[PDB]
Design a binder for this molecule. Structure first.
Ligand SMILES: CCCCCCCCCCCCC(=O)N[C@@H](CO)C[C@@H](O)c1ccccc1
Length: 236
């Protein structure tokens, strides 16, 4: 890349690829808090200074869409308001490359506390597969950065995030005279979110909100990708 965040991007993508994909099923520091269909949501309970930082990991498997498609929809700001429900306002502060932008946004008061905002680089990348036996990996990383055109606000508490949507497409081609269809593909999703609320809120409540809001998002977002791609040629 050309832009000034290229090194930080790679580090984030590499850290997600080595640590965020790690298996969490039989990890005793992780608790399965939500299950529904192919969807599972785990959390690790962590606090620093009485502030709840609980890392969150969700895994999902969505029939009929590719990882490329799910990442595309996740990243594309032009469709954000079609699925995202926790945001008051947002805008793009800077475009760094074709695949990388910085975004400022304010969240609805889902917490018993002052309104939060967040300012983050949002980048979409493909990680090539080592062999053709393996899926390519598409990832969108959303992580907090600073920018001059969005200094600390005086009304909102500035949250800090490290988030990734990581997707791999499994294909199961049919045996006969038929071409691959969407009935023959399945997107495996790992979604990780590490959010620093930027100040105190009662923990019991933050965990309630996380338990409620992440699975809601993943269902509506994934369903929306299924809707928008249905009947359309497959983008691997
Ligand atoms: C900082 C105040 C956020 C309040 C918590 C709301 C739970 C969010 C569930 C859905 C996240 C969808 C989600 O990942 N949204 C992205 C597009 O808006 C930005 C994002 O990567 C982010 C993740 C977590 C918190 C804030 C932004």
């Amino acid at each position: 890349g050309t832009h000034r965040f290229v090194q930080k991007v790679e580090e984030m993508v590499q850290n997600h690829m080595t640590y965020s994909l790690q298996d969490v099923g039989g990890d005793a520091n992780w608790q399965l808090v939500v299950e529904e269909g192919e969807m599972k949501v785990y959390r690790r309970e962590v606090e620093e200074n009485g502030i709840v930082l609980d890392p969150l990991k969700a895994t999902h498997a969505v029939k009929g869409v590719t990882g490329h498609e799910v990442c595309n929809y996740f990243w594309n700001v032009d469709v954000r308001n079609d699925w995202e429900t926790t945001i008051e306002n947002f805008h793009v502060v800077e475009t760094l490359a074709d695949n990388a932008i910085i975004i400022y946004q304010t969240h609805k008061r889902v917490w018993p506390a002052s309104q939060r905002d967040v300012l983050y680089l949002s980048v979409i990348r493909k990680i090539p597969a080592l062999t053709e036996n393996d899926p390519e990996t598409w990832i969108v990383c959303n992580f907090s950065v600073d920018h001059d055109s969005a200094p600390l606000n005086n009304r909102c508490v500035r949250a800090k995030i490290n988030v990734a949507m990581i997707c791999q497409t499994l294909v199961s081609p049919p045996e006969g005279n038929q071409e691959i269809s969407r009935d023959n593909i399945l997107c495996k999703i790992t979604y990780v979110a590490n959010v620093n609320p930027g100040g105190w809120a009662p923990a019991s409540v933050l965990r309630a909100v996380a338990k409620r809001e992440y699975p809601k998002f993943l269902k509506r977002f994934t369903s929306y990708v299924q809707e928008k791609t249905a009947g359309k040629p497959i983008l691997f």
